[PDB]
Design a protein around this ligand. Sequence first.
Ligand SMILES: [Zn+2]
Lengths: 287, 95, 53, 751, 49
Amino acid sequence: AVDTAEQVYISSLALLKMLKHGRAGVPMEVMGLMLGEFVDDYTVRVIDVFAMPQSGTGVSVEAVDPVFQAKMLDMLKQTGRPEMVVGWYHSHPGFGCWLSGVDINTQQSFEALSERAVAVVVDPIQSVKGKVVIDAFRLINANMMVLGHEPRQTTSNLGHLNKPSIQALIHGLNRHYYSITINYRKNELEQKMLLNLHKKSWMEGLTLQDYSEHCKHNESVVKEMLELAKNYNKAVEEEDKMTPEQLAIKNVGKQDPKRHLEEHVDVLMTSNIVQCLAAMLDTVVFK
Amino acid sequence: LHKNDIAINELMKRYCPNSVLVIIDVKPKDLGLPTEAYISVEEVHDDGTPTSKTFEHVTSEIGAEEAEEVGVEHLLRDIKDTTVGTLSQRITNQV
Amino acid sequence: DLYSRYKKLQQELEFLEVQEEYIKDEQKNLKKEFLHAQEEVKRIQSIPLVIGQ
Amino acid sequence: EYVETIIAKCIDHYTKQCVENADLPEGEKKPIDQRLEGIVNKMFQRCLDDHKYKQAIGIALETRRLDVFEKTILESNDVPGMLAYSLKLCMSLMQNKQFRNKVLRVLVKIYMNLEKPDFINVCQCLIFLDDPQAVSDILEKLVKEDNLLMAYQICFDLYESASQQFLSSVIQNLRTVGTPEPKDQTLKMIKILSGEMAIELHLQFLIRNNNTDLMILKNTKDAVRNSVCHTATVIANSFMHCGTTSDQFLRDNLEWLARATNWAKFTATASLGVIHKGHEKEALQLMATYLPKDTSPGSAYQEGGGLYALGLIHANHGGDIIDYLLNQLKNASNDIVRHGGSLGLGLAAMGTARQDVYDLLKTNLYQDDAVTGEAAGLALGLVMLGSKNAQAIEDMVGYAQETQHEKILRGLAVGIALVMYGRMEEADALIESLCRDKDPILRRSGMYTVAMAYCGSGNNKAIRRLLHVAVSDVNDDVRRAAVESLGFILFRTPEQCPSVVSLLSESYNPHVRYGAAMALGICCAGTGNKEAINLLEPMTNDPVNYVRQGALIASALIMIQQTEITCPKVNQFRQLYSKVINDKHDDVMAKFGAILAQGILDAGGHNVTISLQSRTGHTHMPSVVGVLVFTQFWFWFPLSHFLSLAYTPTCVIGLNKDLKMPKVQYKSNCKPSTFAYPAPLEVPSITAKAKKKEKNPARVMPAQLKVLTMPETCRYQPFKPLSIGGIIILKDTSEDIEELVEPVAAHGPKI
Amino acid sequence: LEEGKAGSGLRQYYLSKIEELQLIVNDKSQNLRRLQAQRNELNAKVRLL
Ligand SMILES: [Zn+2]
């Protein structure tokens, strides 16, 4: 009878494998297996994550082929992957990320070997592309109903765990069903390689190709955006001619939610491209 | 680019279809685009040299379709989007 | 007290002068976060949607 | 006009060249013409005809000259006022220590030639210079002067604070001097470095000044939970029962403490270690009497809490049991002798800088474990106070990036953070080089490391990168862990803090609001500035529990030691008292920080308080360490037990003889009803004399030190005029019979 | 003498002008921090969104 403060380490490997697995996450029930290494009691690290072939039965203990699982794990052991399995993941599209009776039964059957049994459910179908915040699931002991539910120390991270604060699943099904916090980790190779790779993904090949395209399109295509921009500017000034009457009568309170200022500032920002690229044309013409 | 790459790529030329070759750097110190698509096709030379495997450079782009942009943007939380205006333009015009 | 107000005041000169580059950093960074969060809440609005009444 | 402008620009350019050439004593010295010295020293001496008692030391310090101020104090009245005003002006100019030590070491030669030596100058200088050559004369003149009463004060305060390793060296410096009045010098040198008399008197008046109420403890038992606040109840009980050794509150029942096998029993035993402190026999005997049957407890948290609690008891004592702690720590055990034994051993061996604890600590952290490596990091940081080992920093920073755990990185982070003390001119390239590290934990370690290194507001450059990384960086770790260094360097002025952190009170993210709440909690602690109190109201109302917890802690650190008649604290008293009754509709941690904040005001029964600096202006090391580790409860909550190391009781001492206790009764010019105790509910224009008797001195506000007036008809009177509060002795002016000696107490909760 | 009232008088007046420059830095910090509170209140508002 002892419990500690565990935290699931999530790198970019399992994240991207859950993003591609989420793209291939058909409404049919899918299967997955997570790997890693156990260094101590209250920490867990995942490194290897792969997918499993779909079946008509779906998420079940019968669909897990022991000769296929042990075969692929042996093929990973003969290679440079000396990590044991740490859990299994899946997707719950539509009906919510909660776990049914079959999922908790195969979880109870699959947790006999690993005491942790990390469970992660990705659902990018109804999740907006703004946030990709994911949550990890855990299994509580049925004999702990008499004592405290979760005697876990370090209650500070619960504020970070309160971000998924849906009012139906967390305390709608919190009985015998809790969760755990999730953190990330990034070394210098992922920071410089992935940062420079993303900056290059938003940059050009030689970085000097598409500059003259806009520098010379300022005289052909942008002129239409400047004339239309002046058409919207006049379309606002026609009301700005009527503004000094009300502003000259009431001067108390604001009724129009439009600011009429930041939009013109943005128009000036779009207009400053000519000024910023004029020096570019000066450098291309000069040398 | 070593000479053995014709024998390494020749296996996937016999068994598999025309294989593309990509040379990258072991250290992320190269400022340029790390990916270069090199097609494995034989070209006729004008000087009269015998026909051999030629690696022609094919242009490449680094883009994500649906989710990898969200995952990378969430893992970084430091990079900025296009953000047309003063800073995103003047940084390119300086560096 | 009379002559000590100069040298004692110099500490307030440095403490108030040091805030210049600080408020520069805040006014130059909080607008970058303003356009970050602004584009983050702006990109939520997607083209595929349902039409009600 | 012309003459005053040419002498004005002549003096301005003169002191400008004196500043440009003051930092370069040797090499490439710029030539100074003699006519400039003539025309500056002419009108300068003209001003020095009478010195006008205002600009002598001012212009004498602005010119940065060697013998410019020695001739000023020759013909001058009120020498102690000129040296006290001199050091007061020198301590307020943000010195760089390059010339302050020279000016002090050259100005301490004038009072020894007078008719009698003063203590305010030698104290206010020895708290800053810390030079061994400045004490060798004053330690040997005590025998030549043959004066016993005057040495007790300087021994009490110099052996009290202002130095740890300088005391560790001066104890053997004075131990060497003397025999290897011979009969009197022996008991003198033995009794001056004892230090247990302060524990005896503090245990005495603090053992007879306790006042407890059933409403607070009954409210804690009514709002106790079995999950989170179980540690808050026992840590609040340890706060209110600190020093008084009142275990009868925990002797009511055993089903409320050992009901769950978890860290709650470790925090309960460590809290018990916070309750009783300063016991050489009742501590080990009290820990051994709990189960002296089989010597095999099923829960090792009692042994770990016994070692950690023992380290809390024997902190900074001369009678350490460390020799037995090595033979007891050598035994192989599971994460309790290593963790609790490492914390207790490092806390008991703090300042010793022994290589033994370094070796066994290294071989204790070589197991790659994060818990014993975190406790080993704290213990190494404590024992390495002032050591500055060469291979230790490079070995720890080399051990940092080669592991994946975070508790080892925070343990070695605080380990390399506390070791940095007095390295203002040394840690520049270390903090500047380690500031750009890829690890956010080590990035916080650079700020926490530079925090204690730049104490005293002596560097206005570090704040550039402190706030630059607090606002510019995207990770909230250095953002909420950044401003603690700002408060640790700007703790001198309480008014200037809310002007620059008021923007951080309501920031963008709640992390900067929480860390800024800790900043307001540590910067204004022990003061009475309302510039944060009037801003506490917007902090306590927000949907985020972070700013609410940090707001209750920041308000709990300011409401202590304050009367209601001075400021209307009814707002924060009512809104803070409504948290324990409103905990049903609040978060689980909001009530934890709520009752944890309520345990601060009731700590010690309003008798003991906290202080960031001493009376002479110098800052206490265990107070800063105790308050920073007290703020480090976010990652590890049981780390808050080090708050007892910062408890500084505010009172007076009039002990004349070591074995004779006199009675001193003064009078205050204020109302006695305004300084009474705020007695809570039951829930079943001038005073004649003060309430301090038999010296049981009660609490005293630092602002009350200016309204005290000693009675003219008092039989006894000290030699030094009692002006400010501190530790002094009494001078027997009558020298007659009936000294009014009082007996000593008997056995009980204490020894 | 006539120095503390004349020399230190013009030096004290110059110190008052320095207090005027510190009043320009002062109220620049005031309005810059109030506008900073406005931008922080708007970005915090879309954060609440
Ligand atoms: Zn389904």
